Amino acid sequence: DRSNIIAERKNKQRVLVLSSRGVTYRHRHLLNDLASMLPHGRKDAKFDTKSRLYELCELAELYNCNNVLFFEARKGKDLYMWFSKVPNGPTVKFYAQNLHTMEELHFQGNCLKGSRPILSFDAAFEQEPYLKVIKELFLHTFGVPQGHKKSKPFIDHVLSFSVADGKIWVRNYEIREVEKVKTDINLIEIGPRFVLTPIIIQEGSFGGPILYENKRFISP
Amino acid sequence: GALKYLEELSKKKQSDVVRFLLRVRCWEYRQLNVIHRASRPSRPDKARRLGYKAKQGYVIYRVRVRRGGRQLKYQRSLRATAEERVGRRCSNLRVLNSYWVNQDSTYKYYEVILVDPNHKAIRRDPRINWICNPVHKHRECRGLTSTGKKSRGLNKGHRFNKTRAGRRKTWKRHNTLSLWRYR
Amino acid sequence: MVKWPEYIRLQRQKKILRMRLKVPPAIAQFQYTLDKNLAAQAFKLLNKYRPETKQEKKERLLREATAIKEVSKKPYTVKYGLNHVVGLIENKKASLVLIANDVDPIELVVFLPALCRKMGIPYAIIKGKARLGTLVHKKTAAVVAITEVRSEDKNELAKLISAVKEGYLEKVEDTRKRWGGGI
Amino acid sequence: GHKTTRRVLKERPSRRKGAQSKRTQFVRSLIREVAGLAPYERRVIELLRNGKDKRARKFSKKKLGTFGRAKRKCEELQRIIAESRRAH
Amino acid sequence: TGLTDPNTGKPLNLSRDELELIRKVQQGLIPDDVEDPYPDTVEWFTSVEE
Amino acid sequence: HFRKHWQRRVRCHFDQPGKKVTRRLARRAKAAALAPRPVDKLRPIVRCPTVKYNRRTRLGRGFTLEELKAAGIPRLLAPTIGIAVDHRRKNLSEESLAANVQRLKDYKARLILFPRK
Amino acid sequence: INNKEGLLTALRRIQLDINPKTTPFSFHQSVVASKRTEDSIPQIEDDLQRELAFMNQALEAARLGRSLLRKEGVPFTRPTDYFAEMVRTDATMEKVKQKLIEEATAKKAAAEARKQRDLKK
RNA sequence: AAGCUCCUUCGACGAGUCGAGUAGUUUGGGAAUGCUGCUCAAAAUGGGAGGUAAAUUUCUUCUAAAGCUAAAUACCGGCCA
RNA sequence: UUGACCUCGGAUCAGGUAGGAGGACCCGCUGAACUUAAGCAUAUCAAUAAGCGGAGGAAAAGAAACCAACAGGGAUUGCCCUAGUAACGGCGAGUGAAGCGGCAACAGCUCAAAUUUGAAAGCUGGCUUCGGCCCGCGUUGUAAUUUGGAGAGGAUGCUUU
Numbered sequence A: 001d002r003s004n005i006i007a008e009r010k011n012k013q014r015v016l017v018l019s020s021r022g023v024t025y026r027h028r029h030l031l032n033d034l035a036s037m038l039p040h041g042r043k044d045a046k047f048d049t050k051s052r053l054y055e056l057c058e059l060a061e062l063y064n065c066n067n068v069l070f071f072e073a074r075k076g077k078d079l080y081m082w083f084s085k086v087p088n089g090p091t092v093k094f095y096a097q098n099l100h101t102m103e104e105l106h107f108q109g110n111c112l113k114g115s116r117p118i119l120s121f122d123a124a125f126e127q128e129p130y131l132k133v134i135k136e137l138f139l140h141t142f143g144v145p146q147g148h149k150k151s152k153p154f155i156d157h158v159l160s161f162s163v164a165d166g167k168i169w170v171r172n173y174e175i176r177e178v179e180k181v182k183t184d185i186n187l188i189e190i191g192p193r194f195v196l197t198p199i200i201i202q203e204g205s206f207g208g209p210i211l212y213e214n215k216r217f218i219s220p
Numbered sequence B: 001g002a003l004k005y006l007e008e009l010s011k012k013k014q015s016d017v018v019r020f021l022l023r024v025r026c027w028e029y030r031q032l033n034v035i036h037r038a039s040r041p042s043r044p045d046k047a048r049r050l051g052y053k054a055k056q057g058y059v060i061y062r063v064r065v066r067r068g069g070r071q072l073k074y075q076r077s078l079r080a081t082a083e084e085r086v087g088r089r090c091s092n093l094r095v096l097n098s099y100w101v102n103q104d105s106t107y108k109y110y111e112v113i114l115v116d117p118n119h120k121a122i123r124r125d126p127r128i129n130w131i132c133n134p135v136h137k138h139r140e141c142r143g144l145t146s147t148g149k150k151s152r153g154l155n156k157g158h159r160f161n162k163t164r165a166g167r168r169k170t171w172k173r174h175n176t177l178s179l180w181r182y183r
Numbered sequence C: 001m002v003k004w005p006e007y008i009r010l011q012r013q014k015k016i017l018r019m020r021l022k023v024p025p026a027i028a029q030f031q032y033t034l035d036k037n038l039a040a041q042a043f044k045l046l047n048k049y050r051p052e053t054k055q056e057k058k059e060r061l062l063r064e065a066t067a068i069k070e071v072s073k074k075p076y077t078v079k080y081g082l083n084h085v086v087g088l089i090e091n092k093k094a095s096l097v098l099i100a101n102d103v104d105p106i107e108l109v110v111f112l113p114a115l116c117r118k119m120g121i122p123y124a125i126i127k128g129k130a131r132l133g134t135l136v137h138k139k140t141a142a143v144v145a146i147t148e149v150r151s152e153d154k155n156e157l158a159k160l161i162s163a164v165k166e167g168y169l170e171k172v173e174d175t176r177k178r179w180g181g182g183i
Numbered sequence D: 001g002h003k004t005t006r007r008v009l010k011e012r013p014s015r016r017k018g019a020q021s022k023r024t025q026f027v028r029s030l031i032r033e034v035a036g037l038a039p040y041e042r043r044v045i046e047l048l049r050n051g052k053d054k055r056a057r058k059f060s061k062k063k064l065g066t067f068g069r070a071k072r073k074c075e076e077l078q079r080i081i082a083e084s085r086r087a088h
Numbered sequence E: 001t002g003l004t005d006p007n008t009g010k011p012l013n014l015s016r017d018e019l020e021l022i023r024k025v026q027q028g029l030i031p032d033d034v035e036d037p038y039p040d041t042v043e044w045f046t047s048v049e050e
Numbered sequence F: 001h002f003r004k005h006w007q008r009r010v011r012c013h014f015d016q017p018g019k020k021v022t023r024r025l026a027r028r029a030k031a032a033a034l035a036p037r038p039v040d041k042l043r044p045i046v047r048c049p050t051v052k053y054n055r056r057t058r059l060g061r062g063f064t065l066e067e068l069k070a071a072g073i074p075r076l077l078a079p080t081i082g083i084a085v086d087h088r089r090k091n092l093s094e095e096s097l098a099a100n101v102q103r104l105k106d107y108k109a110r111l112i113l114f115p116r117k
Numbered sequence G: 001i002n003n004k005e006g007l008l009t010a011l012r013r014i015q016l017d018i019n020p021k022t023t024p025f026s027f028h029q030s031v032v033a034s035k036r037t038e039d040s041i042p043q044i045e046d047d048l049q050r051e052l053a054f055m056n057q058a059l060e061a062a063r064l065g066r067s068l069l070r071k072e073g074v075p076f077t078r079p080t081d082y083f084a085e086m087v088r089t090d091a092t093m094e095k096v097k098q099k100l101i102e103e104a105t106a107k108k109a110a111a112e113a114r115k116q117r118d119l120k121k
Numbered sequence H: 001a002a003g004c005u006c007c008u009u010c011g012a013c014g015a016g017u018c019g020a021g022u023a024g025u026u027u028g029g030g031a032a033u034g035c036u037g038c039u040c041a042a043a044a045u046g047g048g049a050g051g052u053a054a055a056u057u058u059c060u061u062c063u064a065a066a067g068c069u070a071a072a073u074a075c076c077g078g079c080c081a
Numbered sequence I: 001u002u003g004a005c006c007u008c009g010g011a012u013c014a015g016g017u018a019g020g021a022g023g024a025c026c027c028g029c030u031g032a033a034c035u036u037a038a039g040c041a042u043a044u045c046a047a048u049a050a051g052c053g054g055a056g057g058a059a060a061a062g063a064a065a066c067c068a069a070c071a072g073g074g075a076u077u078g079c080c081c082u083a084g085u086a087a088c089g090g091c092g093a094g095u096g097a098a099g100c101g102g103c104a105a106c107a108g109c110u111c112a113a114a115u116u117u118g119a120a121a122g123c124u125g126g127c128u129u130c131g132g133c134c135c136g137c138g139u140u141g142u143a144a145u146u147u148g149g150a151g152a153g154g155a156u157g158c159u160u161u
Helices: A025-037 A057-062 A129-141 B002-011 B016-031 B044-049 B078-089 B146-151 B167-174 C006-020 C036-049 C054-069 C082-090 C111-119 C129-135 C151-167 D022-035 D039-049 D053-064 D067-087 E016-028 F016-033 F065-071 F094-109 G005-013 G047-072 G090-120
Strands: A015-019 A041-043 A067-074 A078-085 A091-100 A117-120 A157-163 A168-178 A184-189 A193-202 A210-213 B035-038 B058-066 B094-103 B107-115 C096-100 C123-126 C143-146 F045-047 F057-059
Touching (some): A025 A041, A025 A078, A067 A129, A129 G005, A168 G047, B016 C006, B016 D022, C036 C151, C082 C143, C096 C151
Antiparallel strands (some): A157 A168, B035 B058, B058 B107
16 A cells, blocks of 8 residues: 555546746745645646647656646736646636735734645536536545644635636635633635636646636736 | 767866866865965866966966855945955956855955966067057056946846946936036 | 975875776876887878978968969878867767866866767877877877878778777776776 | 637747757767766666666765756666666 | 786786775766676677678 | 036037048048949848837847848859848847848849949 | 537546546545536626626635544644744744745734824814 | 959857756845855757747747957046136 | 987076056946935945946957837947836835937957868977078878858859959
């Protein structure tokens, strides 16, 4: 046994977070904030944009990771997300904006790194299928397997994914206990704030035939 | 075409024959002086592409420079310090160029090419007699060599906006209040 | 006790170090030099093909100019010059190559036994960069090549070439790929 | 925007300003054999001969610093293994 | 501590200063243990004659 | 914006009438040396880069090699008869080419050339 | 372009068998809320209401998850003795504690300025 | 000696340098804006900088680590007016 | 025994050169505080002053590893405008460009990478009847040819000293 899962049925998941060659400190801090939360992931930096998309696959095969979260930077100003099942599974592309990182002293919330989250989804993540595919991809990227030996055990935070206009808004809150008056959970927000606008669904790993197209996207 | 084979050898300087030669030469240079005269360049391909010629008037000087920090960092490079010490030693010559020749755990070793502006073999050659002009006195002190141009940021592009025409000249121009007659 | 001068001691310590360290097998092959008989028989042919000196080149020019005031074939000499000989090696225009064993930037001659092996030209590492320079009327000569000889001595050149591929390159065969020194 | 009759340009002689000549590739293959291998290249060659190709790509990446250079170095060292085996 | 030359030579006699100078540069010039640091040269390029 | 010492770095321009005299004397001094020749070299007609100024057209630096060969002027002669030559610029369209080989053909009609010695 | 059947086809190949029939809540810990939360938000520029809507969404996710987690039974609340490493640097909490000092001390010192000028009138 | 033309022939281009991590400095400029120091340390249908959601890094434009060069510009000093 | 070659030294040997001054303007190095923010530490002051090194009549820069996204521009420098724009900001203090455009002036080149190899063809000195003789440098490379919007070598025919 090599997958370090102590559970009745092992959820073998790994992610590989990556960066482009021109990200900003705001996009760099979202690597550090997301990877700190994400206990079964490896950090890597500065993928060559002159390479091809499917060289992100054997990069992840080199590190035994079935998920990849790529931060691609264009113009030195714009963050673009990529969630993908590495061998042959589907992928996604987002435009990320309205960034607010953990280093900014205005959130007043904190939690253990590596602790297991609760995934707080939205109602439209169930009824409409283009939200459903990214739902399973979000759930796998933040999978945090059961018997993972790098995970701290007590649960104190919940990740909230909600769609408002056409865009998904992420939220992170800390579970805190205040006793009821003759204990209820009060949420204090911890970490990353970003707004996630879908762009495409591709049926391949990083190419493959196009499945969803967001025909309302105003590019920067 | 022996020099094409030497250019590929300097590329592979961690390799077996080049690590051996750099080890046995760095040992020899430590017993020598801090600044001393070399009869021929240790890397004749590198010296020649930097301007060295086997003429009366061209000399090669080898210098070791202490390595490490000055966390204060010296903006003057170790190569520029290598040029400035030799030009002080040879006040009659002109520093043409310099190149890396060896390094150690304490020292870094450079070979500098110098040209005699008073030798009339040099004075008669149109390819080198520009250096006989007195605007080229002590080029290593004004940052006019290849190390100096790198550290002064004299490169084209939007990345070098503040330094491509002179950094202090740019600051004086931008900080000048210009008043005309018919305002 | 007594004290030795600085450059005196460094000459001996470099000799010890170059022969006792773990020498890579491109410098260690230079420790193997051809026999006294083969060197003498090589210079018997090569001295017959000595280049003309400056005194007798000027005399011949005065001879031909005089006859114009009041018919030859291609001159066969010994080819020299590192950049010239390497090109003659690369175009397969050379028949026998002689390489000095004491070139003090040794990088100028490290590739040269293996380059002659790749193109098939018989080579022999010889004692003396001074000896080859004497043969070619200079102070020094790193490499000496023969390309074509006159018809009176095509047989003794082919005999000398066979004496190199039998007397020198056969013994070098399983000892040119091995590291030198040790301890 | 505006429509113009685009011409066909003569080939710029600065295309591929590095090496594609057969002479330079001969020199690089000669110098690599006469000079030997770097200490980190001996590590990768040992791992590539032992089949640990997964470790070899990682090790070249930490030494060189870039995944693209790590692929090229492991490709070049793999060819050396191939042509050394044939000569043996 | 005389040790015989590896090329089947002769039991050497150099002074202690001569032995220390050998050990000084050998420490700076040694790849590692375990793997063979000094292999023979396989002529993978000069075996084929141009 | 007077936080720094703007007193020490203020430049007036009372030499504006005097520099104009020098500049006009430099053009007269140049025309004394090049007495039958024009002062300035011939320059090509080029289109301004951006979308803002695409419709405008200005003088460039020098004529392309294809423009010179189409007009019939050899390359090595053009700097010696008052034609500026740019090796960096390319033509990329027939409209840029045809406008300049008309200009060079018009230059040759108005040009009078004197023999060497 | 929104190919529908191929979209769910790709979902099958990465579908985990998340179902309370066999898989407990401890496996996935994923909660889908009944409220749309787009109906909760009247205007997207209302920063107070938009923050409350996402907070309210994570509210019922947290309470429902807490109830299911005790029914299966895991250690849910960190005890007083688990000195475990935070997702934030400790010094970051030190400077955010200093900022909460500065904001709150400014409010009460301004109230002292009120009482001085209440004497003035 | 030189320029052009044509071609069943060739066409070499700068390495402890790029680059990766890190510290200092600096800038309007965390593709570090630039530079310097330390550790490691490249390529050859190569390298650099851009453009682009447009479906894959498609296209665009230049060739770094060698060097020279008048003019338009500055000028509380030098010879004068 | 002799004679080279390399390397390191000596010489009141012959021929040269550097120092110091000046420093308004120019090129590098190093580098501060008050002040402002009605307190003050990031910041500003200021990449300034003081200190150190090095040049000229100008210096520096300079013939794209550039700008651009065009119907394209085309070395460097300076003026006007861009523009108190973009950008960065105890987002307070504030700091603060560049491309395009109109002008002034305009100029382009030298190497390394090649085998002259049917001829080191190159150069410093000395003696000189000034005409041409010796020594030395140099093959670990001095001339000629070439420098990537190129070029080489053949062939062919016109045109140039």
